[PDB]
From Swiss-Prot, chain C:
GO terms for cellular component: cytoplasm; nucleoplasm; nucleus; RNA polymerase I complex; RNA polymerase II, core complex; RNA polymerase III complex. GO terms for molecular function: DNA binding; DNA-directed RNA polymerase activity. Present with 6090 molecules/cell in log phase SD medium. The keyword Translocase does not apply. This is DNA-directed RNA polymerases I, II, and III subunit RPABC2. DNA-dependent RNA polymerases catalyze the transcription of DNA into RNA using the four ribonucleoside triphosphates as substrates. Common component of RNA polymerases I, II and III which synthesize ribosomal RNA precursors, mRNA precursors and many functional non-coding RNAs, and small RNAs, such as 5S rRNA and tRNAs, respectively. Pol II is the central component of the basal RNA polymerase II transcription machinery. RNA polymerases are composed of mobile elements that move relative to each other. Residues 41-62 are annotated as: Leucine-zipper. Its main location: cytoplasm.
Swiss-Prot record, chain D:
Zn(2+) binds at residues 45, 48, 57, 60. Component of the RNA polymerase III (Pol III) complex consisting of 17 subunits. Present with 1950 molecules/cell in log phase SD medium. A zinc finger (C4-type) spans 45-60. Belongs to the RNA polymerase beta chain family. The chain holds residues 1051 to 1149 of 1149 of the full protein. DNA-dependent RNA polymerase catalyzes the transcription of DNA into RNA using the four ribonucleoside triphosphates as substrates. Second largest core component of RNA polymerase III which synthesizes small RNAs, such as 5S rRNA and tRNAs. Proposed to contribute to the polymerase catalytic activity and forms the polymerase active center together with the largest subunit. Pol III is composed of mobile elements and RPC2 is part of the core element with the central large cleft and probably a clamp element that moves to open and close the cleft. Transmembrane segments: none annotated. This is DNA-directed RNA polymerase III subunit RPC2. It is found in: Nucleus.
From Swiss-Prot, chain F:
It is found in: Nucleus. It comes from the Eukaryota. Component of the RNA polymerase III (Pol III) complex consisting of 17 subunits. The chain holds residues 36 to 70 of 251 of the full protein. Belongs to the eukaryotic RPC7 RNA polymerase subunit family. The gene is RPC31. This is DNA-directed RNA polymerase III subunit RPC7. The acidic domain is essential for its function. DNA-dependent RNA polymerase catalyzes the transcription of DNA into RNA using the four ribonucleoside triphosphates as substrates. Specific peripheric component of RNA polymerase III which synthesizes small RNAs, such as 5S rRNA and tRNAs. C31 is involved in the formation of the initiation complex.
From Swiss-Prot, chain G:
Belongs to the RNA polymerase beta' chain family. This is DNA-directed RNA polymerase III subunit RPC1. DNA-dependent RNA polymerase catalyzes the transcription of DNA into RNA using the four ribonucleoside triphosphates as substrates. Largest and catalytic core component of RNA polymerase III which synthesizes small RNAs, such as 5S rRNA and tRNAs. Forms the polymerase active center together with the second largest subunit. A single-stranded DNA template strand of the promoter is positioned within the central active site cleft of Pol III. It comes from Saccharomyces cerevisiae (strain ATCC 204508 / S288c). It is found in: Nucleus. It comes from the Eukaryota. Component of the RNA polymerase III (Pol III) complex consisting of 17 subunits. Present with 6020 molecules/cell in log phase SD medium.
Amino acid sequence: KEVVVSETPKRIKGLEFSALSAADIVAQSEVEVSTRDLFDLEKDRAPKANGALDPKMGVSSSSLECATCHGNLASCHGHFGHLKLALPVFHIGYFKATIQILQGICKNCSAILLSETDKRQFLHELRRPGVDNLRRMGILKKILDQCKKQRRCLHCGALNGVVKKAAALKIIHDTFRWVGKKSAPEKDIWVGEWKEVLAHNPELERYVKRCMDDLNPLKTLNLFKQIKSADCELLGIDATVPSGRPETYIWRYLPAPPVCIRPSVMMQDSPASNEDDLTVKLTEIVWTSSLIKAGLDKGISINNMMEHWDYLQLTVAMYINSDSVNPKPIRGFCQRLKGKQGRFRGNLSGKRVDFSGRTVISPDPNLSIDEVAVPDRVAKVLTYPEKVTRYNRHKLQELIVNGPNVHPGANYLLKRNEDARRNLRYGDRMKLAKNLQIGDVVERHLEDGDVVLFNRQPSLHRLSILSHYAKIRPWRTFRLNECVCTPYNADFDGDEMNLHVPQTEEARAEAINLMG
Amino acid sequence: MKVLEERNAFLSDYEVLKFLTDLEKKHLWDQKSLAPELQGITRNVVNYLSINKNFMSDESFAELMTKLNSFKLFKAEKLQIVNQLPANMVHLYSIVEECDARFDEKTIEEMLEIISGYA
Amino acid sequence: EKAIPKDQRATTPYMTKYERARILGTRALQISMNAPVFVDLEGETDPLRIAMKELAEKKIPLVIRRYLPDGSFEDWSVEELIV
Amino acid sequence: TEGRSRDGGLRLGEMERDCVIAYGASQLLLERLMISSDAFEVDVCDKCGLMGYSGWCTTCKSAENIIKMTIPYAAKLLFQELLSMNIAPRLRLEDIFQQ
Amino acid sequence: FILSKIADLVRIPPDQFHRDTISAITHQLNNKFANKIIPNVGLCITIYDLLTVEEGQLKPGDGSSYINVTFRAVVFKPFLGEIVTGWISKCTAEGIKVSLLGIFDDIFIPQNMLFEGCYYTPEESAWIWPKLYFDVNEKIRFRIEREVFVDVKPKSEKPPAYALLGSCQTDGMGLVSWWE
Amino acid sequence: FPSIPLPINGPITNKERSLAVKYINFGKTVKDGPF
Amino acid sequence: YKGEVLGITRFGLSKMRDSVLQLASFEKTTDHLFDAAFYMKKDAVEGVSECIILGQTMSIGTGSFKVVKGTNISEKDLVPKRCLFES
Amino acid sequence: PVCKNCHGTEFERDLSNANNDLVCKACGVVSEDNPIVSELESREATLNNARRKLRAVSYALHIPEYITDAAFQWYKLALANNFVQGRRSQNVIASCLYVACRKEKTHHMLIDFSSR
Amino acid sequence: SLEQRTLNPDLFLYKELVKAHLGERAASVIGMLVALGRLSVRELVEKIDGMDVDSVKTTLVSLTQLRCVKYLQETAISGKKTTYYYYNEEGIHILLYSGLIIDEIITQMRVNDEEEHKQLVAEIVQNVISLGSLTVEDYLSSVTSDSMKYTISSLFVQLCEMGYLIQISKLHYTPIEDLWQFLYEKHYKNIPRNSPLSDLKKRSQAKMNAKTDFAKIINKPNELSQILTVDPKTSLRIVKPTVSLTINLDRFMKGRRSKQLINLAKTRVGSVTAQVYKIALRLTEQKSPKIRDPLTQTGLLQDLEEAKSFQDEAELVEEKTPGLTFNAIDLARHLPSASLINSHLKILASSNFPFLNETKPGVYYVPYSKLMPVLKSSVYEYVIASTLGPSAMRLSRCIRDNKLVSEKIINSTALMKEKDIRSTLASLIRYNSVEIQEVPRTADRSASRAVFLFRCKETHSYNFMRQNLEWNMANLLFKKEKLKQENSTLLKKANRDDLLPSELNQLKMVNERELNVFARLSRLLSLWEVFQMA
Ligand SMILES: [Zn+2]
Ligand SMILES: [Zn+2]
Ligand SMILES: [Zn+2]
Ligand SMILES: [Zn+2]
């Protein structure tokens, strides 16, 4: 029930980007993968305890069941997991976008290297309604140079030099910029601090000039934790949003993607599955962060655990993008989204279609322009959905009794109450032919007069694709008329092409009146 | 789906039967075809409210109701006493508040013969 | 920003290529959805072919709303255009 | 699946994709790129708009503001893989009608 | 018995083009709204009339014509003290299951404004009275204080949609034949 | 679920018990006043 | 049309038109998306290479206008049935 | 496994027209469309060495590997049944070979083991 | 509650203060100014949504009266007058320290006993600022026509001339930097062209004129020469009745600083000298060096030749101020014995904590500039010993005096075993009392081929502490309002009467537990306010 439901269809006005917070990672996750090993020694069919291809994280097989949403393979849309690091590391993708925002702040009070009336001028060029991304990123070049042309901060006067890379994937801040004025309190304490260790082990005297303060992810997170929200708009970040802190721009937590993205493919070279590189890189992540978590708790050497945390720093910097291996190389996220026909060209821009067929082409004078002659053997393969009306009822009642053995028949059907389809070669047809509820769709074969397009594989221009009429012919090749070879620049020397068929009614009309 | 006004107007219970009997009329001979889901519900509105009235002209209904709402401002109870225990004043004692200390005249007997004359 | 009547009707009076390809695409699937026809059909199938014949007598019960790029309306009945 | 022994289904590539817009056809371009190939139905949440599963939101767990629509499956995996690293594709909707 | 001006969009399949404009709009809004509760408003039974109608727009993927339309419908919202001479067909041992027969039966009203000798007797009676008894299938007077409208769906009968608050505080409450 | 509390966990002393009454009437003047 | 000579290169497309998922279809993908998600940008979808990824109506060609069904009705039968408001 | 109309238990994959659909012969309703093709450590270490030793003399005596693979499970159960402790490691596995040599009914004797 | 513990700077503290005790519509707008910085109304309504443009001004006058924001007017040559609106950070601290002022009136005005204004003088603070501003005509025009008002009116000149009742003006309601600009431009337009020599010094010629103007104009509200009316009839002395005044935080925060210092004495001496120190501490409270240092807030603090001058003169002011250098002779008459006044003060110079340590012989005074850094170093090391192990207290002091400590000398200087210090040091990197210094002995800074060096870094340790406590304040404030959400139907019944016998139990157990919240917050707020001495 006695309750109404009503919802309009909707449209997309435009996607917008963000980086979600580390509290959102556990907010959308439901499982946790603390343990390491994928296959328990129960010798079961799906041995997965906690930290593996988890059955309520998703499903990567046809014989299993996704315990969260439901289903075997089609109902599951995948569900997310999460990780918890022992201590955070940098983000490899934002590694450029975290060092540019480090050059602007102070290194002691963590305030933007600007004066009060100066920064009030800069955001005035943000508040006007005319701002493009051309000039948004243009005026942000000036805000960084003024902070880099400003040596000492405003809140505690601390001198700040320059920070840049150490070429692994770590950055150092060159804090000392003296011209001739060595009489600075920080430098005098610096030699006063350094002289205490010169008494012991004085062989490090050639290492004094190279010695310099570093910025590990554990210092920089609390450095990013002090800086306020009122001044975020000057350096790229916006306020008023939950994830608007810069604290969420290095890896502290990591989500686990569903197993649909990383399918457990069975190559059938053995009864074992060739498990992909996506899981075993993730498996080394949770194993390394486990021993570092337990290592400092039990108590191990600093010089021992620092290379583990640096190995884990390089580990996450490979799971996303494998360019930073600095050596058969592992495939990563970046290593498959770009490239020649990895994505975006063979998966997004150019896809693969159903209802096609590729044989050779053959000349014929006797058929007309605008019509391709159709081989009959593929005419009983490629079909077309046809809704029933009172106008075509007598024809479709005659058509359905032919079946998929003579040419002018059907292959399948879909009744208005039926859900998926019904086959025609199984079961009685004539008793099934007598009912024919008008509100449904039938699946007839092709015939003369239908709308078929045709292409050339070297597509030089727009006239490399044209839509034609049809006529079924009892031979095994594509017969075309003599004039139409010129735009296809074809030669009948052993080449071949495919033909496509649309399966709506508005495309059946649109192909004639635009590419006829 | 946007509700513009929740309480747009008020309508008497006569038109609850009057317009709906016209909807029962052009309705494929209801109630006598013995020899959707909505048509049972609409008829359940027809039969239940009419029996309480039974067990007519709207011009007669308007004349007595114009005499009923003699109040200064608080009148809204003049619509609810149309089918709620007619010819009874101990029920009118329980309908509207502070009328036991305000109606102590021949009005409540004048309202009695209107309500009893309706039944 | 609103409806613009026939006084300020300052575009082409002509049924374009994209118009005639659009109205046939939106007509013929309604014929498959059991819409009643308006033309004296013969014994005839392929609801596109009855739809292109209905165009000959201009018996389409539709109207096209041309949008101006400043967000302005402009209406055109399907009989008003010629081809 | 690419391959004649792999039961075929041929790639309509990008160089052929641009010629359709050169005809200006706007519906079989939609039909032959997701309807004939890659149709998939996703329910999406409205506010903090990301996908959910069969009937849930699981990011504001009330499962009320849910919009039934459809996308390419190849688009469905697209903003799932970029969600694996710290990228939030915040989705914003309008109705088609009432211009 | 009161009107509620609302707005909504409506669809039509292309096979009802033989019918005129309004009578198909009436039909397609009926089975959407027939005996349906509204979130936080009430239960509109029948569309009363049509206020204004706009022009039919088309989805390019569907081909049908979709129309937004504003109108009001009839809905009963009696009063917050309204006398209702309803019936009953159920009794339980913690309150009373006063439900108006014929229309809706999702109503449990308590007895929270009565005297102190009120309990349950499992001998056909509500309780023993200090007084002609009342039973099912008869005109029983009961009024209304409050109502509770919630719209929650906690996925993981007591329908919490349309629930009313009633009492029997004064005399004559329990049977209309106690008076008149 | 988290460990290591702060060491300020004490029953309230009458030296500051009247001090805590000065808060609850303070907002009662403001909220029940104009705003 | 934007004031300056600029190529059709990576350097030439970073200033001509900025639309981040269309730029994902070009050579360098990852460098265009992090800084965009760092800036938390907002682009409406109107590109012909943009509408095909999401799968909605392309705005060019025969998808510019939209089709309206005439309702062939007026106010001559759109009167209320309101009667006996209060008496 | 169960139809929704006839509830049949027999399903037949039709490959006549290269659609590879799943359908029963009783009523003819399809089951599924668009098929989705699949495109201790000390106990571990003491068998990793024992794996090397099984492979050693099998290369010497030209033993085909479906015995050496089969003989490892004969060693695996007696590993659990405490047969290995105390006895010499070289002695026990050569006895484990001749079990599978006898079960496979080969020409291989027993003194060919002990002479090496 | 992992949602709350992540996304919250001091904005989650500042938004909830007006969400605690005020209407709801102002908690939205106060979050906008802190997040965005500064903005006028003409761009405010574009940022928020759900509040009309005059409903903004209807909301904005609420915290205008309570002095919770501070405005600035700037007009353009082409445009009209634009009123940029800033945030007030100290007017909202009044809502934080709201109860503590009532315990400050009593503990500092001890001349009276068993008075009949004990209930009244606790209400005047609730009268002076819960209304917002306050003038003399507001309380005399109350329901009491006289009721001995002349006793009460003469009671407040005792209560105003001790301080923290400074007449409000534009200076209290405008921030510190937007005043300094146009007065520096006033002195700069006082020096025109036709002085071309040393033009870098001529830019500073207005700046020397700005320094004397800054101390002058900040003393104008502190100037007590015009806050009083000498009345020839019916009285002897009275404040001027046409004075609009509120509280001043300055003497309270110096007075709150004064209570903080003596708590070190009770740790560092017994019960006799701490009682001796308490009396002489009180006399210097009304005229004390400023805690917030308005000179150092925003200005030429980037260059050390000016940044030194903010304490070179300030030490000379604190040394050469007459109103604190007591003779140690007047102390005996204030104690309820000049040898014992000198003998019990001799322990104050003998300790290595510089209070009453340096002086001219015969006169005695407590230094300030070299004392408050020792108090901040003292309490946090004790907090390390309080909430975690005392072995870290040994290690915090070991790295403190030993600059650039190594991993070998840490077992040479401090004496513990090897396995326990890993279980103690590793929690101090997590909480940032220790830091890391690396020496690259191989190429490209190899992590395994490197040894690691430590540091105290006496600035970053205390910045982490401040926001750790600013969140913990609002975390307990978050558990206040949520308890008022449930059980609200009988708290509404608890406010409609001015009686179910079992319902009253569910009102007391919720009321005893929130009584612990204010007490722990008062214990918490004292630990945080030590580190605002910057
Ligand atoms: Zn699931
Ligand atoms: Zn600094
Ligand atoms: Zn959402
Ligand atoms: Zn079956």
